[PDB]
């Protein structure tokens, strides 16, 4: 969907309607705590709005916005994971970004940083909105068809007519109560986003493409935007319960992958063009290392990049991972010095590590973070 850096546009409409919708739909018997947190969320509406549009303006490592797309039919066609996932980081999709920003929002909320947490939740909603945009779910880019920018411009100009203020259900109903059933956020999120994205993808094929009529476009925009609103409300509801209901999710959960959110310093030569690796060592002495590399330019000055690592061993628990590190490798005589500001590691929905660094890394060097 379209959005603007000042926090206005289709994306902000969706996020804003999301809190209005959740408020109308909240059942009268819902615990007081759920309403208190909703209220703090409303106080921070401006950040939710800024977050909901920001990813389209982030100077990142994605030259063609690949992470704003997601095909809901791939992420489980039951084709085995490529062997390269074991030595190289894997790129993000709109679905993986929802999990990433959600984990960052829950973490900041618990630490009491409401503005930053709300901003993060907004970015999570931005990616859900993308997962619910017909052209994004069908992977039809601006290069494949002029229908992409046209449909989005068309939806942007009529955004006010596409607003809704209820999902048609109250929190006591199935739509919302089914959101609390699965204790595991990541798996609930993936299938929740998937049903909405599959619906959006079908709308590309049935009503939104360049071979359809203006009335078909009207129906596609209406359903896709209403769906984007309903799903956003669903996420906010899940969020409020997660940050309110204090349950520790079990440290006995298998760790299939780790995600690192790395912030490079803003000093002049903080960025580097050398090879950068992320690695781990278990209690059992086994180690695994991956090259960090996204489609665009990684580790530039002041950037914030994400890297996903698939573990070779799928029966490990977070506690089995004894050490974690990043490592720089040069090809020239002295190489390119790197100064990371902060690194966060996420596992199964929780940020298990948050380390400020602000120290230079030189030559071929290994810097331990855990
Ligand atoms: Zn968008
Ligand atoms: Zn688009
Ligand atoms: Zn986007």
What CATH number does the domain containing 283 carry? 2.60.60.20
Give yes or no: residues 134 and 195 share one domain: yes
Give yes or no: residues 35 and 109 share one domain: yes
Name the closest ligand to CA 56: 3
**All residues at 6 or more sequence positions from 230 whose CB lies less than 8 Å from its CB, including other chains:** 21, 164, 167, 175
1 Cα: distance to centroid of ligand 1 (angstroms):
3
* Cβ–Cβ under 8 Å, residues 148 and 210: no
Helix, strand or coil for residue 133?
coil
Question: Which of 250, 285, 310 is a domain's end point?
Answer: 250
Give yes or no: residues 194 and 258 share one domain: no
- Give, in order, the Cα–Cα distances in Å from 358 to each of 31, 146, 266: 43, 45, 10
114 Cα: distance to centroid of ligand 2 (angstroms):
29
Question: Which of 188, 222, 250 is a domain's end point?
Answer: 250
55 Cα: distance to centroid of ligand 2 (angstroms):
12
* Cβ–Cβ under 8 Å, residues 348 and 186: yes
Give yes or no: residues 126 and 270 share one domain: no
Give yes or no: residues 84 and 148 share one domain: yes
Q: Which residue has the tokens 């940083």?
A: 113
* CATH number of domain containing 188: 1.10.575.10
Question: Which of 217, 250, 283 is a domain's end point?
Answer: 250
* Cβ–Cβ under 8 Å, residues 358 and 265: yes
Rounded to 5°, the CA angle 239-315-245 comes to 20
272 Cα: distance to centroid of ligand 1 (angstroms):
30
Distance CA 6, CA 156 (A): 15
Give yes or no: residues 213 and 150 share one domain: yes
Bridge partners of residue 342, in order along the sequence: 263, 356
Give yes or no: residues 234 and 246 share one domain: yes
Resolution in A: 2.4
183 Cα: distance to centroid of ligand 1 (angstroms):
29
Give yes or no: residues 255 and 228 share one domain: no
Q: Which residue has the tokens 């609103």?
A: 229
Give yes or no: residues 17 and 72 share one domain: yes
Give yes or no: residues 227 and 285 share one domain: no
Residues annotated in the binding site for Ca(2+), as ranges?
271-273, 293-294, 296-298, 337
256 Cα: distance to centroid of ligand 3 (angstroms):
27
**All residues at 6 or more sequence positions from 153 whose CB lies less than 8 Å from its CB, including other chains:** 2
Distance CA 62, CA 296 (A): 5
For residue 39, give the nearest of 236, 222, 221, 230 by alpha carbon. Answer: 236
Helix, strand or coil for residue 205?
helix
Domain range for 95 is 1-250
Give yes or no: residues 231 and 297 share one domain: no
Rounded to 5°, the CA angle 232-177-193 comes to 35
Helix, strand or coil for residue 177?
helix
Please state the domain count of the chain. Answer: 2
Per-chain residues with Cβ under 5 A from ion ligand 1: 1, 130
Give yes or no: residues 225 and 303 share one domain: no
Residues annotated in the binding site for Zn(2+), as ranges?
1, 11, 56, 68, 126, 130, 136, 148, 152
């Amino acid at each position: 969907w379209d959005g603007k850096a000042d926090g206005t546009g289709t994306h902000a409409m969706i996020a804003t309607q999301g809190v209005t919708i959740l408020e109308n739909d909240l059942s009268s018997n819902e615990p007081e705590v759920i309403r208190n947190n909703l209220e703090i969320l409303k106080q921070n509406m401006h950040d939710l709005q800024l977050g909901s549009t920001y990813p389209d303006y982030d100077k990142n490592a994605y030259d063609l916005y690949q992470d704003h797309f997601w095909d809901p039919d791939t992420d489980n066609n039951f084709t085995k994971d490529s062997k390269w996932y074991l030595s190289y980081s894997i790129p993000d999709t709109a679905e993986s970004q929802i999990r990433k920003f959600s984990a960052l929002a829950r973490y900041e909320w618990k630490r009491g940083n409401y503005k930053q947490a709300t901003f993060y939740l907004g970015e999570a909603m931005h990616y859900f909105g993308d997962a619910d945009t017909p052209y994004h779910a069908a992977n039809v880019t601006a290069v494949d068809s002029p229908g992409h920018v046209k449909f989005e411009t068309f939806a942007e100009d009529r955004k006010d007519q596409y607003k809704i203020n209820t999902t048609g259900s109250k929190t006591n109903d199935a739509f919302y109560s089914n959101i609390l059933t699965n204790e595991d956020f990541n798996s609930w999120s993936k299938e929740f986003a998937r049903s909405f994205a599959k619906t959006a993808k079908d709308l590309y094929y049935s009503h939104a493409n360049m071979s359809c009529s203006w009335d078909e476009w009207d129906y596609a925009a209406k359903v896709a935007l209403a769906n984007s609103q309903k799903g956003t409300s669903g996420y906010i509801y899940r969020f409020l319960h997660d940050v309110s209901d204090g349950k520790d999710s079990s440290a006995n959960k298998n760790v299939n992958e780790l995600v690192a959110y790395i912030t490079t310093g803003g000093e002049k030569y903080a960025g580097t063009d050398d090879y950068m690796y992320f690695g781990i060592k278990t209690k059992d002495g086994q180690t695994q290392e991956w090259t960090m590399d996204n489609p665009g330019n990684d580790f530039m000055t002041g950037s914030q990049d994400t890297y996903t690592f698939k573990l070779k061993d799928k029966n490990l628990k977070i506690d089995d991972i004894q050490n974690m590190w990043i490592r720089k490798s040069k090809y020239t005589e002295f190489g390119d010095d790197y100064k990371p500001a902060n690194i966060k590691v996420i596992a199964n929905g929780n940020v298990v590590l948050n380390k400020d660094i602000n120290e230079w890394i030189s030559g071929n060097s290994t810097y331990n973070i855990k």
